[PDB]
Design a protein around this ligand. Sequence first.
Ligand SMILES: CCCCCCCCCCCCCC(=O)OC[C@H](COP(=O)(O)OCC(O)COP(=O)(O)OC[C@@H](COC(=O)CCCCCCCCCCCCC)OC(=O)CCCCCCCCCCCCC)OC(=O)CCCCCCCCCCCCC
Ligand code: 07D
Ligand code: 07D
Ligand code: 07D
Ligand SMILES: CC[C@H]1c2cc3[nH]c4c(c3C)C(=O)[C@H](C(=O)OC)c4c3nc(cc4[nH]c(cc(n2)[C@@H]1C)c(C(C)=O)c4C)[C@@H](C)[C@@H]3CCC(=O)OC/C=C(\C)CCC[C@H](C)CCC[C@H](C)CCCC(C)C
Ligand SMILES: CC[C@H]1c2cc3[nH]c4c(c3C)C(=O)[C@H](C(=O)OC)c4c3nc(cc4[nH]c(cc(n2)[C@@H]1C)c(C(C)=O)c4C)[C@@H](C)[C@@H]3CCC(=O)OC/C=C(\C)CCC[C@H](C)CCC[C@H](C)CCCC(C)C
Ligand SMILES: COC1=C(OC)C(=O)C(C/C=C(\C)CC/C=C(\C)CC/C=C(\C)CC/C=C(\C)CC/C=C(\C)CC/C=C(\C)CC/C=C(\C)CC/C=C(\C)CC/C=C(\C)CCC=C(C)C)=C(C)C1=O
Ligand SMILES: COC1=C(OC)C(=O)C(C/C=C(\C)CC/C=C(\C)CC/C=C(\C)CC/C=C(\C)CC/C=C(\C)CC/C=C(\C)CC/C=C(\C)CC/C=C(\C)CC/C=C(\C)CCC=C(C)C)=C(C)C1=O
Ligand SMILES: CCCCCCCC/C=C/CCCCCCCC(=O)O[C@H](COC(=O)CCCCCCCCCCCCCCC)COP(=O)(O)OC[C@@H](O)CO
Ligand SMILES: COC(C)(C)C/C=C/C(C)=C/C=C/C(C)=C/C=C/C(C)=C/C=C\C=C(C)\C=C\C=C(C)\C=C\C=C(C)\C=C\CC(C)(C)OC
Ligand SMILES: [Cl-]
Ligand SMILES: [Fe+3]
Lengths: 44, 43, 44, 44, 44, 257, 274, 305, 47, 47, 46, 46, 46, 46, 47
Amino acid sequence: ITEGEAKEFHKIFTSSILVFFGVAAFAHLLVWIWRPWVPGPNGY
Amino acid sequence: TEGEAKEFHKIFTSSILVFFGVAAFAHLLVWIWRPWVPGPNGY
Amino acid sequence: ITEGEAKEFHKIFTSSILVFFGVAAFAHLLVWIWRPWVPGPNGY
Amino acid sequence: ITEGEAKEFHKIFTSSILVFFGVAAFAHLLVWIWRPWVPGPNGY
Amino acid sequence: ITEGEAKEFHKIFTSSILVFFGVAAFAHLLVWIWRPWVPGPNGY
Amino acid sequence: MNKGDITGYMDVAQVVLYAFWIFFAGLIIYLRREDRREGYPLEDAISGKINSLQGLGSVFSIARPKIFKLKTGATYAAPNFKRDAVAIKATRTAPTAGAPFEPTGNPMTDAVGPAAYALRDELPDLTLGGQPAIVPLRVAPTFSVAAEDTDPRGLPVVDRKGAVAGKVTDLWIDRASIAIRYLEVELAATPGRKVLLPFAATRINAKTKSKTVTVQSILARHFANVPTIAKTDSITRREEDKVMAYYSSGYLYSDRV
Amino acid sequence: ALLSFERKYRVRGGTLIGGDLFDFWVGPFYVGFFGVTTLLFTVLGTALIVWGAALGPSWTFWQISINPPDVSYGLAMAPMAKGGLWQIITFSAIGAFVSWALREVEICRKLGIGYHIPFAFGFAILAYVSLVVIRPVMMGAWGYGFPYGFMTHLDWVSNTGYQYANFHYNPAHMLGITLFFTTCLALALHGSLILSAANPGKGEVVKGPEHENTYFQDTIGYSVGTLGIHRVGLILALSAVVWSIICMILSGPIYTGSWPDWWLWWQKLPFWNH
Amino acid sequence: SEYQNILTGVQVRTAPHSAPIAKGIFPRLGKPGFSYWLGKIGDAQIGPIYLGTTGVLSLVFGFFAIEIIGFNLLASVNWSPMEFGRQFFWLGLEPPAAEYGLGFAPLAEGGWWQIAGFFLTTSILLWWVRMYRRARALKMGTHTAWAFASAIFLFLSLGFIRPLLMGNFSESVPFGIFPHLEWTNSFSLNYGNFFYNPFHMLSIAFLYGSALLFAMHGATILAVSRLGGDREVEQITDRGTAAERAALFWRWTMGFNATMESIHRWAWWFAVLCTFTGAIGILLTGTVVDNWFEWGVKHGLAPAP
Amino acid sequence: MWRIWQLFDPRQALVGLATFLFVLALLIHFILLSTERFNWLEGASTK
Amino acid sequence: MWRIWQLFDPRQALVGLATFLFVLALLIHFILLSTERFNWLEGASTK
Amino acid sequence: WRIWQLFDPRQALVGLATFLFVLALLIHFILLSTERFNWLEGASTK
Amino acid sequence: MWRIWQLFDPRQALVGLATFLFVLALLIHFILLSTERFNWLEGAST
Amino acid sequence: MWRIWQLFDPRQALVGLATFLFVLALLIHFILLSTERFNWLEGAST
Amino acid sequence: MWRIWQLFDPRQALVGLATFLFVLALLIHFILLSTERFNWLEGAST
Amino acid sequence: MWRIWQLFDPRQALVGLATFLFVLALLIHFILLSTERFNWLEGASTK
Ligand SMILES: CCCCCCCCCCCCCC(=O)OC[C@H](COP(=O)(O)OCC(O)COP(=O)(O)OC[C@@H](COC(=O)CCCCCCCCCCCCC)OC(=O)CCCCCCCCCCCCC)OC(=O)CCCCCCCCCCCCC
Ligand code: 07D
Ligand code: 07D
Ligand code: 07D
Ligand SMILES: CC[C@H]1c2cc3[nH]c4c(c3C)C(=O)[C@H](C(=O)OC)c4c3nc(cc4[nH]c(cc(n2)[C@@H]1C)c(C(C)=O)c4C)[C@@H](C)[C@@H]3CCC(=O)OC/C=C(\C)CCC[C@H](C)CCC[C@H](C)CCCC(C)C
Ligand SMILES: CC[C@H]1c2cc3[nH]c4c(c3C)C(=O)[C@H](C(=O)OC)c4c3nc(cc4[nH]c(cc(n2)[C@@H]1C)c(C(C)=O)c4C)[C@@H](C)[C@@H]3CCC(=O)OC/C=C(\C)CCC[C@H](C)CCC[C@H](C)CCCC(C)C
Ligand SMILES: COC1=C(OC)C(=O)C(C/C=C(\C)CC/C=C(\C)CC/C=C(\C)CC/C=C(\C)CC/C=C(\C)CC/C=C(\C)CC/C=C(\C)CC/C=C(\C)CC/C=C(\C)CCC=C(C)C)=C(C)C1=O
Ligand SMILES: COC1=C(OC)C(=O)C(C/C=C(\C)CC/C=C(\C)CC/C=C(\C)CC/C=C(\C)CC/C=C(\C)CC/C=C(\C)CC/C=C(\C)CC/C=C(\C)CC/C=C(\C)CCC=C(C)C)=C(C)C1=O
Ligand SMILES: CCCCCCCC/C=C/CCCCCCCC(=O)O[C@H](COC(=O)CCCCCCCCCCCCCCC)COP(=O)(O)OC[C@@H](O)CO
Ligand SMILES: COC(C)(C)C/C=C/C(C)=C/C=C/C(C)=C/C=C/C(C)=C/C=C\C=C(C)\C=C\C=C(C)\C=C\C=C(C)\C=C\CC(C)(C)OC
Ligand SMILES: [Cl-]
Ligand SMILES: [Fe+3]
């Protein structure tokens, strides 16, 4: 793997992981609005 | 080679500091939610 | 491992073990203040 | 198999399968007349 | 496999899936008329 | 209830169990005697004099030599009490009996460690018909590769670092066991030099159309030092051992040598 | 002391870890770093077993038994007197067996042979780890592990089998049994054939591969040959263990009922479910 | 990865051949075939099989036994092929009840079991004579027949010799898949848990030891297979480096080792002793020990209940 | 559709098809014999 | 999409596809026979 | 600076990532076994 | 004292020592979780 | 249809067909013997 | 992102996907059949 | 940071990562289905 190939892979990888984390972050937000997962002192 | 290892050290020392930083923030949030050292009467 | 490398290592190692023991000693002091671990005659 | 040899086999296959389906269709008709196999709302 | 041969197979394959899905869709329609398979709120 | 009793406490099932233990101890003695038909008596690690820690069972420890009769009319004795020379082309890293040896020179050519071999007979293994068992397909015209398989002949021979050692020019087959035992490789360097390659030290890679015999054991530079054989169409048991040991040493020594 | 052919093979190198420091022999035994850690775990676990015998009610060897904690502890570590001893012995035994496997690897490296033996021993380790770790973890309590005792582990086998009404009906157990019986059959045949070829009888010459193949062709119409039988004999033993592991991961973690009742799916197949 | 020698990548073919034997009444039967997948694991040749007078006898007796079983199983479901398949594992042919002793029971009340058992027994003993005589014809040792005799000794102990000692066939084994498993379960429970039978413990140790030895030995020969170790009888008659390194691996691992010949004696004896100690454990049950757990309590295996 | 005999050997096709159709037919008749309504040999009534 | 046949052998593909579709069809009929509502041979009432 | 002169940087990453994941997974499962810290069951601090 | 690091290889020593210290530390935390008084997660009263 | 004997060997055909027909016939006679109505050997009444 | 098909063999990608997606789809349909609410063949009430 | 792809093969990295992430995703969905609060298929009340 050349420097240029590694840097090109890193570009595609960086975009893909950022998109994947972006979708997952929105998924967690929708789940949180429905039922949050941190209980209060009295529980849920 | 040593310079090649020295730039690895740059990436390492920075990447651990964010890892420990994220972990430290996570522990602080968990402590604010529920602390994990019990008093004499227990929790 | 050359003599200059062995002296270099020994300095770093000797500092590192003293830092490790120093952190551990403070951890044990904190735990002892929280709950000591030597029971009396009537227990805890 | 040549093109013509395939086309010749396809002729005999086509008549054979249509005869097989023709006998089977008549057998299913006779069985249906004896006892049909689609139940109404009340069952059988 | 040459392009013309692949395209010739794709032509017959395309015709076959349309017949197969057409027959299957007719089968599902008749079964739905006999007993539908999506239950209402009270169930079946 | 009295049913099984031999005495107040003793009973038949208990007696039969101790009779088994007596038999089994005797069987272990017999089996350990058989285990000592090669390699024994033990020797001192440094001097090579016959010495070991022994009890009074030493007197039953090693069996009388059994004689195997070979179809050539020769015989082999076990124990034969033949033993390897005390000197080897290596020296101890420390003077204690348990210390390891360090090779003095090139271990692959000096035949120490995994390059070492047994001084087998300078005779080929034979078919039941008395012909030599292991021979090139050139000389065994009734044999063939099964039509389902890749024939190795004409394929390049490639090391784990991707260097070409040569091309396969023949298969040596075992007439008695009906298997490929070696590939005969013509070397890329010093062209016309041919060496045997143990077939179990290879696999065929065919993920790419120009399929190839890959060799994990040794690198391309080591093929020029593969042990030679005296005849072009048969191989003695000693030559087989010498060749096979050389490749088996590659996993330890090929990045050293 | 050494065998008559041993010295030429006792070369330096092949260690996985620790370098030259451990690369030596004590009599016949090779040491290495995993020899040392083998001894560490072995002495610790053995002495803790003897300590458990001193704590327990009898020195009668057959009756000695170190027991897992009560199931009420779940997967927590128990107090030493209340099952924690079994937990320490268990992980020491894992350490000992893993060290034994890695020490065999070093010996393979030094001799230039393949790693088939420590690989095959890795299935013994996995079977032990399945019974004392994986199954009790999936069942949620260490108390499902077997007790360390000559008769009490057999009592645990009895109790565990009859918990599922009749363990003979577990289908994976049937296949495990079949492969164990087939392994012993194949071993009897293999030992016999080599001995019959090497020991043809007085006044007879030693027989070779053609005779070896011909005996099983004549008797049963097939011969697997001298290389195939070692492949088969290995695969049989390892498959018997794999199916044994499966039969126990099924029983409790996955299937909880009567094994005799499981088979009633067969009698309910629509082509004969009259 | 190096080649692990588990499957034969390239396999060769030649004219099928086999070692000569003296002319008998029957030649070697069948045209030798070859299959590709058997050639990957082992030798490809689905060779001819020898028949001979003893082979005829064994197959005739054995066929009659298998027919008597199979016909009785199908009769027990009133000849229905659907209920035969539905019930197959649960079907069995039972021995006679105890009141018949060792005389002939009525056919429907275990007489067929007695005939099937006798014919199966005779067939197996004739197969032993076959395994013996095929070795002598090849001028080979009789080790395989004597190993087989240990398996037969357990089979005879289960089916006939213990019934002879008990005076009736009622606790003999039924011919049937789940039935012979149910016999195994009930036999242990009636005699007070077979785990406490020490000869069953011995039989298990040798059963486990057989799988241990074949795993060790199979892995060993494959580990030295790039050194010619699969050519074991040749290594027995001229020790190669493969036999030397196999010995040293085990010596350096566990402090002791076999030879290339003697490891096959360890193998032979462990598999034999599994069934031999098994047979003894069966023959002592009910004849001299009526409850193995109670015997175990007496001899210190368990605390007093 | 005749080009399918350029894809497949007629000898193999017919032997496979004969085997398939027989096993399928045997399965269907055995399924019917398991029913009360369609077991013709036992002839339960259509109540 | 005719380029699929430059990736996959149509002969192998059709054999695999026919085998898959038969096993799937056979599964779905056996599933329906297990239900009360859709077992046409037993024909339970739609109460 | 110098520890990478003593250890292979590839082995450092592979071992350390595997170690940290297994440790993290263990700690989350330990907390799930507690009443106080099982966030998915959410018992009250009575 | 530095001559020790020519006699024992720092690559081997630090790997062995780190492995040893982790296993020991893990053992001690699990022992404390076995107790009533020192199980910080359950947090019983004194 | 006679070309089927160019497609298949008559020797293989007759052995397969004879085997098939016997096993099919035997199956049907066993099925009937298991019935009440058609077991000719037991002879239940109608 | 087309470079991913130089990285991975397209024929293995499609065969892998088809295998994965069928097994996943079949799993999800069987999960739903294991529920009262979504088993459409049993069709329990809401 | 891109130099990590000199240190680790792009092909094995993506395959190993996708395998890791799928197993982790399945684990979390199955854990949630074991809970009363978050089993969406069962859908218990937040009492
Ligand atoms: C610290 C942790 C310790 C965990 C437990 C470990 C138990 C075993 C002990 C292992 C260490 C033994 C070390 C040893 O003996 O070294 C001798 C050697 C000097 O010897 P030498 O000069 O080279 O001469 C020796 C030679 O002449 C002897 O003859 P040979 O070469 O033909 O045979 C070698 C011996 C070596 O045996 C061993 O090392 C131990 C073998 C394994 C025993 C396992 C017993 C438990 C299992 C069940 C047993 C079952 C028996 C029946 O070979 C044999 O004796 C092999 C006998 C094999 C019998 C197999 C039977 C199989 C049956 C299976 C069960 C079937 C059930 C139906 O020593 C030296 O060079 C000096 C330095 C070492 C001094 C050692 C001091 C003592 C160490 C004791 C360790 C602590 C023990 C608690
Ligand atoms: C019987 C005539 C003679 C006699 C004087 C003698 C006495 C004793 N030997 Mg012995 N032995 C004799 C002959 C002989 N011997 C051995 C071997 C061994 C090895 C491993 C085999 C083993 O499992 O033994 C099994 C039993 C057999 C073979 C019978 C003799 C041993 C008995 C009855 C002692 C058993 C009691 C114990 C508490 C356990 C001992 C330790 C272990 C087995 C590890 C093992 C350490 C051992 C122990 C002892 C002891 C404790 C004594 C005592 C109490 O005097 N013997 C074999 C071996 O490989 O040796 C390196 C072998 O070849 C061979 C031969 C030919
Ligand atoms: C009422 C009881 C009931 C009854 C009906 C019944 C009957 C039968 N069953 Mg069974 N069984 C029952 C219950 C039941 N059943 C099994 C198992 C099996 C397996 C065992 C082999 C195996 O697994 O080896 C798995 C191998 C392991 C665990 C390897 C362990 C060894 C290692 C790591 C190394 C250890 C080394 C040292 C400590 C070193 C010491 C020092 C020195 C020597 C110096 C096998 C296939 C099998 C056979 C049969 C038969 C032949 C019968 C007959 C004839 O009736 N059964 C076990 C299993 O599958 O475990 C994974 C399991 O747990 C379990 C249960 C609970
Ligand atoms: C509730 C069940 C209870 C429970 C406590 C328990 C559990 C376990 N046990 Mg056990 N067992 C129980 C009962 C019990 N147990 C045995 C026996 C054993 C031995 C068999 C050795 C052999 O090779 O058999 C197998 C070999 C045989 C039977 C003899 C060779 C076979 C021959 C010649 C027949 C040749 C065949 C033909 C020519 C084909 C003819 C065709 C047709 C008829 C159609 C073996 C070692 C063994 C293993 C374990 C394990 C691993 C376990 C575990 C892990 O729990 N058990 C037998 C015996 O020897 O007992 C001493 C026997 O009789 C008997 C009984 C009644
Ligand atoms: C996987 C297929 C089979 C297999 C394979 C196998 N076993 C092997 C090997 C192989 C290939 C070896 O190379 C290795 C060996 O060296 O063989 C001589 C080994 C081995 N198989 C052994 C035994 C064994 N294998 C068994 C089973 C099997 N082994 C399978 C059937 C069994 C059974 C079923 O009961 C036993 C008892 C050893 C002889 C040996 C491994 C030796 C070893 O690990 O030594 C180092 C450890 C010690 C000396 C002792 C450690 C002590 C612990 C600290 C405490 C242990 C306590 C224990 C948990 C409880 C005991 C109480 C019992 C009553 C339950
Ligand atoms: C040492 C103990 C182990 C052992 C060993 C062992 N078994 C052995 C041997 C050995 C050493 C043999 O030599 C022998 C053998 O041949 O092995 C290949 C055998 C054997 N072990 C067997 C089985 C076996 N072994 C087992 C176990 C064990 N075997 C132990 C684990 C088990 C079980 C339950 O664990 C079984 C089932 C057999 C495969 C075989 C003995 C074969 C035999 O005796 O066959 C007798 C004959 C018949 C059953 C009849 C068949 C009839 C045909 C249907 C005829 C068809 C054609 C004919 C021409 C038709 C004629 C019709 C007309 C008469 C109308
Ligand atoms: C030096 O090297 C050597 C060789 O080379 C020179 C060798 O070659 C060999 C010899 C070894 C082999 C050829 C192969 C060994 C392999 C195994 C043991 C593993 C696999 C099992 C077998 C090959 C079967 C062994 C037994 C045989 C071949 C039969 C011997 C007896 C007869 C021919 C006569 C009587 C028996 C008959 C006719 C058949 C016996 C029954 C079977 C074989 C089983 C059939 C299956 C069933 C009944 C179904 C059971 C399962 C059911 C119902 C459920 C699941 C459904 C299924 C369909 C399975 C050795 C030892 C050797 O040292
Ligand atoms: C091709 O045919 C083949 C052969 O060949 C030709 C073969 O042969 C075999 C092999 C098979 C056989 C020989 C058949 C017999 C085998 C069986 C039936 C299998 C069952 C086996 C047994 C019953 C034997 C069991 C014995 C075992 C497992 C060995 C036990 C020994 C030990 C645990 C000691 C290990 C030693 C080590 C690690 C190092 C050296 C140590 C000592 C000698 C003693 C202790 C240490 C000291 C005194 C000092 C050092 C200590 C230190 C540094 C640590 C100190 C700190 C502490 C805490 C202790 C096969 C397979 C084969 O196919
Ligand atoms: C006389 C006055 C004193 C002066 C002389 C003092 C000095 C000399 C002493 C030497 C004895 C000690 C060394 C023993 C090892 C010496 C070698 C040896 O094997 O000796 C045998 C005893 O072995 C051994 O017990 C070795 C035993 C090793 C294992 C010991 C384990 C003990 C701890 C666990 C126990 C409970 C287990 C659980 C039981 C349920 C007895 O000979 P034996 O011919 O058969 O050898 C076979 C060989 O001769 C065959 O060639
Ligand atoms: C024709 O087409 C086929 C082949 C398909 C017909 C169908 C065949 C079928 C399906 C057969 C099925 C057979 C099955 C399922 C058999 C299962 C057998 C099993 C599992 C047996 C297990 C153990 C049995 C044992 C150990 C029995 C041993 C019995 C013995 C040794 C009995 C000996 C009896 C003697 C010697 C009797 C002596 C008394 C005399 C006769 C002298 O006086 C009364
Ligand atoms: Cl392979
Ligand atoms: Fe062998």
